[PDB]
Design a binder for this molecule. Structure first.
Ligand SMILES: Cc1ccnc2c1NC(=O)c1cccnc1N2C1CC1
Ligand SMILES: [Mg+2]
Lengths: 401, 523
């Protein structure tokens, strides 16, 4: 075992466990009971005041339940350990494998074990609740991938030289297999990995066992309404929106459009567009065709992901580090509100992982209680991004589409 | 004998070194008697003069005879002892229990007295008994078991108890046991005789670990009074609430009553405190007497009546579904009932919480639903099927127009007034032939009209809603309104039906009136 430690001065996590349903509890009991039999975890006593929250999530294309431990706090408190394939994103197709189980074959520094304490609650506080701590490397812990990196290199050694055409990236419990090969010839080189990985309980496919096609991941420019006739209202919305995007693309001008709108006219009054104006619009259109220049990814800054609901099962997001300085922008479409929002968050996380190798910080448009209550019902990732809850304004949403 | 739990002092800290304060020869004696006895029973042990640690002890006279009781002050040791896994913070709600034929409560005596203390920790529990002799040194001991008053005792005791009940629980899957501090509630569906017998088996099992409990003749009988409830094996309620009868109420009385009335609403449907609560407005002191208004009196009398005939709560039957039903009982006031058998309540309650300064019934109702959902998961571990006075279409409509995401589990409409609906809706597109007002403290219309007013004692964002307000007034049935205020926009765009400020409410009134209103924004 490796002597792991928490960042200096820091003590262990003592996170409150969010109430669970009798269904997710029964699941966690059956699961943890078995992990105990195989010595992966052990019951603990009152002398351990630490706690990390746990959940049970469903596995896609499987009838079994997965134990999801929210090691987010512990991971911020775990010491730093001392490379990302700029090419993984370039690849045409990538499959995601859940290799979390690889860890269960490695002991955890005895003196760190206490920090991995978790509780399986009881309905209505009938009983005190079952407490455990880890003996092996826990799936989801920042330290596991690191403390297993070596044994992992030693294992991805042959396939790496055998197929130096397919780039393999590991992130926490996930393994990202990228290639350009044909879907069949690809899915086949994947199964050849699943057999070479089993060679050392098979690593299932996350995300439907499907690919991602990182190439298609597009940036969604700002769009302007293309109309026949333009009413005073249409123009007013045009200027407001332009004014806003002017903050980003300084070449945007509206001076000529603000002219069509002098005086106090009727919102519905149709206004022909003067020559000068029509040209200024066409120009603003040209300017918005591509993302603003000079926006780079700072590896030393946090990635922020903001989502807005468009309605009709349509959402929009933006990943940046500095306001307006978007690194990416996308959209997502159909379920119910929450299910969609969760499917979105995971999608944006997978991409953010693939493109930069780090999960972003989400700003979710939902009440914490509502989120806390339903997210585990549709969540399928093995990781959990950090998140906060907000109240998006009418205008920002109104300036995307 | 039960396992020993490893205890340690917090990081860097060292054990307690508090000098024993002066004790009367009358106390010195009684302590040496109490201690010498505790030394025989193995609970403590004389120690060598090597132990630099000390915790003061003194004597209390338990209002009985002259006999004294020993009290050890562990504040310092507690300050220096590690944190333990917090004792049972949450408690069961009676409505979540399954009825039993018999329920027995047992008190556990000398609880801590019968539980080992980690060897490496005992040296910190060191205390001293001043010898009466002047030139003579007092006797110093240390604990061998969990000391009353120590930080980890409650937690280590529970942990042990749980391990002590393990076997008995497996051999008796049919018996339910709840541990609460020093009490044990034991229930079963066994026939009267069998039940009492099992209780005797448990008692013996506990006694095997030196744990003493009370026999049948001395056990408390249902209903049991626990955490403000009155519990039976088949039904539950809140303990008897008595409304004072008088004509001189102080802020204190009103607050105590509203508090009491609140507790009751979890089972007594129809309790109202709105009017009583208003009495507290602007009050200057806890002892200030406030006269009851004609409506407060009315309210008190009605509660008094609801409270005259006791209502009971039925227990959980896990074989049946949980039905939750909500009703709007006044503006910003909701009430709900959770049952399984049609009209046989497990529990009831009300929701008056308002999230944000402005809001509409659709939001509130949805929040009530969330609050009830959360609550049900805690008590029953599943969500109830809801009965709501809102039509699918109405909900579904506000659903899509709101920027924030949300979800409402299984729910069926219930035609029971008042139904919740939206009082108005903003057009999605400007209206033709509908005049256009450009507001900014005044406005300018496309049809030449205008009006400017001055406002004293007004906030920047308050003058914004004023303008919008003015326009709604001077305008006709259909009206397009243009503004630069994002604030007002947001507020109005959220289509609130209720607010804190009158202004907004007056606006809402105008809005409910119109046939068509469109609001736009311009920088
Ligand atoms: C206070 C309390 C907390 C949790 N459960 C119970 C109780 N007390 C009861 O009297 C009770 C009543 C009905 C059903 N279970 C009950 N019991 C269970 C033990 C038989
Ligand atoms: Mg204006």
């Amino acid at each position: 075992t490796v002597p792991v430690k928490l960042k200096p001065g820091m003590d262990g996590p003592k996170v409150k466990q969010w109430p669970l349903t009798e269904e997710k509890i029964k699941a966690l009991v059956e699961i943890c009971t078995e992990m105990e039999k195989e010595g992966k975890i052990s019951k603990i006593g009152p002398e351990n005041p630490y706690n990390t929250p746990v959940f049970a999530i469903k596995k896609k294309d499987s009838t079994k339940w997965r134990k999801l431990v929210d090691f987010r706090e512990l991971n911020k408190r775990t010491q730093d350990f001392w490379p990302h394939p700029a090419g993984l994103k370039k690849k045409k197709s990538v499959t995601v494998l859940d290799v979390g189980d690889a860890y269960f074959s490695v002991p955890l520094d005895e003196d760190f074990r206490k920090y991995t304490a978790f509780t399986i609650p009881s309905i209505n506080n009938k009983t005190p609740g079952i407490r455990y701590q880890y003996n092996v490397l826990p799936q989801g812990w920042k330290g596991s991938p690191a403390i297993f990196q070596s044994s992992m290199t030693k294992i991805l050694e042959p396939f790496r030289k055998q197929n130096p055409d397919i780039v393999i990236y590991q992130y926490m419990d996930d393994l990202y297999v990228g290639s350009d090969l044909e879907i069949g010839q690809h899915r086949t080189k994947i199964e050849e990995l699943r057999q070479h990985l089993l060679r050392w309980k098979e690593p299932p496919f996350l995300w439907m066992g499907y690919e991602l096609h990182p190439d298609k991941w597009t940036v969604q420019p700002i769009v302007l309404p293309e109309k026949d006739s333009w009413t005073v209202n249409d123009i007013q919305k045009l200027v407001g929106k332009l004014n806003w995007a002017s903050q980003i693309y300084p070449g945007i001008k509206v001076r000529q459009l603000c002219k069509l709108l002098r005086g106090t006219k009727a919102l519905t009054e149709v206004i022909p567009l003067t020559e000068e104006a029509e040209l200024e619009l066409a120009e603003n259109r040209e300017i918005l065709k591509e993302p603003v220049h000079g926006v780079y990814y700072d590896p030393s800054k946090d990635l922020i992901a903001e989502i807005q609901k468009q309605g009709q099962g349509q959402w929009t997001y933006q990943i940046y580090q500095e306001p307006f300085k978007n690194l990416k922008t996308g959209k997502y479409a159909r379920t119910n509100d929450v299910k969609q929002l969760t499917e979105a968050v995971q999608k944006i996380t997978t991409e953010s992982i693939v493109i930069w190798g780090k999960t972003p910080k989400f700003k979710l448009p939902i009440q914490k209680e509502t989120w806390e209550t339903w997210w585990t019902e549709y969540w399928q990732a093995t990781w959990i991004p950090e998140w906060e809850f907000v109240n998006t304004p009418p205008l920002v949403k109104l300036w995307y589409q | 004998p039960i396992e020993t739990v490893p205890v340690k002092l917090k990081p860097g800290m060292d054990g307690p070194k508090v000098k024993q304060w002066p004790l009367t020869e009358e106390k010195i004696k009684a302590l040496v008697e109490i201690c010498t006895e505790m030394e025989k029973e193995g609970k403590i042990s004389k120690i060598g003069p090597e132990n630099p640690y000390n915790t003061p002890v003194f004597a209390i006279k338990k209002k009985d005879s002259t006999k004294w009781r020993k009290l050890v002050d562990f504040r310092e040791l507690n300050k220096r002892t590690q944190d333990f896994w917090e004792v049972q913070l949450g408690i069961p709600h009676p409505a979540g229990l399954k009825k039993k034929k018999s329920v027995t409560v047992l008190d556990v005596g000398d609880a801590y007295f019968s539980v080992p203390l980690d060897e490496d920790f005992r040296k910190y529990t060191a205390f001293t008994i001043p010898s009466i002799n002047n030139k003579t040194p007092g006797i110093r001991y240390q604990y061998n078991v969990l000391p009353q008053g120590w930080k980890g005792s409650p937690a280590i005791f529970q942990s042990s108890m749980t391990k002590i009940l393990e076997p008995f629980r497996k051999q008796n899957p049919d018996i339910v046991i709840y541990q609460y501090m020093d009490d044990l509630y034991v229930g079963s569906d066994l026939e009267i005789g069998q039940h009492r017998t099992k209780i005797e088996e448990l008692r013996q099992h506990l006694l095997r670990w030196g744990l003493t409990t009370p026999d049948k003749k001395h056990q408390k009988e249902p209903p049991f009074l626990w955490m403000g409830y009155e519990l039976h094996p088949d039904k539950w309620t809140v303990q008897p609430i008595v409304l004072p009868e008088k004509d001189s109420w102080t802020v204190n009385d009103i607050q105590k009553l509203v508090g009491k009335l609140n507790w009751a609403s979890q089972i007594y449907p129809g309790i109202k405190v709105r009017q009583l609560c208003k009495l507290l407005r602007g009050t200057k002191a806890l002892t200030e007497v406030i006269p009851l208004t004609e409506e407060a009196e009315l309210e008190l009398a009605e509660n008094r009546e609801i409270l005259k005939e006791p209502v009971h709560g039925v227990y959980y039957d896990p074989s049946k579904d949980l039905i939750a039903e909500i009703q709007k009982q006044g503006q910003g006031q909701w009430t709900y009932q959770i049952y399984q058998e049609p009209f046989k309540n497990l529990k009831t309650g009300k929701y008056a919480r308002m999230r944000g300064a402005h809001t509409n019934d659709v939001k509130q109702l949805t929040e009530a639903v969330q609050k009830i959902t959360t609550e049900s998961i805690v008590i029953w571990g599943k969500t109830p099927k809801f009965k709501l006075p809102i039509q699918k279409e109405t909900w579904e409509t506000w659903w899509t127009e709101y920027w924030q995401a949300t979800w409402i589990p299984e729910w069926e409409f219930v035609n029971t007034p008042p139904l919740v609906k939206l009082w108005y809706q903003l057009e999605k597109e400007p209206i033709v032939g509908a005049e256009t007002f450009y507001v900014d403290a005044g406005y300018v219309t496309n049809r030449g009209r205008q009006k400017v007013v001055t406002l004293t004692d007004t906030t920047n964002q308050k003058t914004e809603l004023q303008a919008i307000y003015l326009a709604l007034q001077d305008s006709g049935l259909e009206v397009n309104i243009v503004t630069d205020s994002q604030y007002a926009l947001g507020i109005i765009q959220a289509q609130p039906d209720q607010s804190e400020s009158e202004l907004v409410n007056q606006i809402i009134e105008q809005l409910i009136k119109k046939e068509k209103v469109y609001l736009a924004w311009v920088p």
